[PDB]
Paper text:
The crystal asymmetric unit of KillerOrange contains two dimers and one monomer forming a dimer with the symmetry related subunit, while the crystal asymmetric unit of mKillerOrange contains one monomer. The dimeric structure of KillerOrange comprises two monomers related by a non-crystallographic 2-fold symmetry axis that are positioned at an angle of ~120° relative to each other. The contact area (~1400 Å2 per monomer) between the subunits is stabilized by symmetry related van der Waals contacts, two weak hydrogen bonds between the side chain of His148 (A/D) and the carbonyl of Glu146 (D/A), and two strong peripheral salt bridges between Glu99 (A/D) and Arg158 (D/A). Two aromatic side chains of Phe162 from each subunit make a stabilizing stack (at ~3.6 Å) shielded by side chains of four nearest His148/176 (A/D) and two Leu160 (D/A) residues at the interface center near the symmetry axis. In KillerOrange dimer, the irregular C-terminal tail (residues 224–230) sticks to the surface of the interacting subunits, contributing to the interface stabilization. The contact surface between the monomers of the adjacent dimers is smaller (~735 Å2 per monomer) than within a dimer and is stabilized by two salt bridges, two hydrogen bonds, and a few hydrophobic contacts. A continuous chain of seven hydrogen-bonded water molecules in the channel covers the distance of ~20 Å from catalytic Glu218 in the chromophore area to Pro192 at the bottom of β-barrel. The side chain of Trp66 of the chromophore in KillerOrange and mKillerOrange adopts an unusual trans-cis conformation, not seen for other Trp-based chromophores before. Ile199Lys replacement in KillerOrange resulted in ~25 nm blue shift of absorption band maxima accompanied by significant decrease of the protein phototoxicity and raise of cyan emission, presumably due to isomerization of Trp66 from dominant trans-cis to minor cis-cis conformation.
Author numbering:
A (entry chain D): 1 to 64, 68 to 230
B (entry chain A): 1 to 64, 68 to 236
The structure:
């Protein structure tokens, strides 16, 4: 009644604080955005606070809101079920022939705004590769795969791909776990998919290092077949 | 001058010979099946010729026909394009907390029958885990991801999941390269997806160790989004 989805029936906002490093160099991001009900198509503005981000903004796409994915009736929406107590996320994305980003995320809801703090360590990145040299152009869509992971968690597996300036491709491997903070016995959804489409663009309003990003996310399932 | 999808406009059949080992134990499988036009929903019957298969049939699912996936107009069908010259597959499926299968596949078309030979090494498997103990029940659907891979290849990435006998899960990681065995310049499709749904049942006619398997496979794409609702770019 006033937990889970019931708390996502109106328009909402969110705010994010990221504390990071890449190959030793530190950085800080703050961001804010919003999601109109019925959700699933939303936007975020982000800025680097410490000056110029020392790596492509593109791999940050997934740090700058699973509870704003839209779920149809018939599939339990774990990330929305986690409230009001909140949730955490532990995530690794490993880039082929390049480095790995490991992040930890906390989410709290107050009123109609969800606040996140994230620490991320980006290590082993190649100084000459497209990430450190800012040569990533588009973000490919993903059909991310979701699985139940014990009584209090769900796991997300994905292939996250980026096109490059010379017309090629860089592949990332995402493995992510969402854990409910409370003791309450929420419904763990069974195996399903979440389709995620993303478009990041530089905001040349300010002379600050800042980007706008839009996301469409929608969960679905696939039927069995008989013999 | 007959090639690619032109060669797939009728009902077809296929035959597979698999030469495998799992943890040093050699085995042999032979399969056959058919696919009716317009393809995308098709069957196979397989049998272990060396007696009793020493592992679960479940992970053999993807060894026992990409060219029978159904593609919509607007997405080039790489596996069909590779004919008449033929198709090779190199593939690895690594299972979490368990072993890795490494396969080499070669496919050739004679008439309306696609013949294939596969070699597969299944190594590092756990003798007490659910593959070696035959405790896998269902095959989860996958939203496989396809990508261009140079001028003569495509790469498939997937997660292949199985349910177990006590109601849990076993996850596999699949990485597969399809290569065209010819020199003509064929179209390499852009990123897209192939949904695959699979159902395997033991066939309990006769004493021989065999299974029946049905697969539904369809390609789809996902569109781009513009920077806001109602714009363009």
């Amino acid at each position: 009644s006033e937990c889970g989805p019931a708390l996502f029936q109106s328009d909402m906002t969110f705010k994010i604080f990221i504390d990071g490093e890449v190959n030793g160099q530190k950085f800080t991001i703050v961001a804010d955005g919003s999601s109109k009900f019925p959700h699933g198509d939303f936007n975020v503005h982000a800025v680097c606070e410490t000056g110029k981000l020392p790596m492509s903004w593109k791999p940050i796409c997934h740090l700058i809101e699973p509870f704003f994915a839209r779920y149809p009736d018939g599939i339990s929406h774990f990330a929305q079920e986690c409230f009001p107590e909140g949730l955490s996320i532990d995530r690794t994305v490993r880039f082929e022939n390049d480095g790995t980003m490991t992040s930890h995320h906390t989410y709290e809801l107050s009123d109609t705004c969800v606040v996140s703090r994230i620490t991320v360590n980006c290590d082993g990145f190649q100084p000459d590769g497209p990430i450190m040299r800012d040569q990533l152009v588009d973000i490919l869509p993903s059909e991310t795969h979701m699985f139940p992971h014990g009584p209090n968690a769900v796991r997300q597996l994905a292939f996250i791909g980026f096109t490059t300036a010379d017309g090629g491709l860089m592949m990332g491997h995402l493995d992510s776990k969402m854990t409910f903070n409370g003791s309450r016995a929420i419904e763990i959804p069974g195996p399903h998919f979440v389709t995620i489409i993303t478009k990041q663009m530089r905001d040349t309003s300010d002379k600050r290092d800042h980007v706008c990003q839009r996301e469409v996310a929608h969960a679905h399932s696939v039927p069995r077949i008989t013999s």
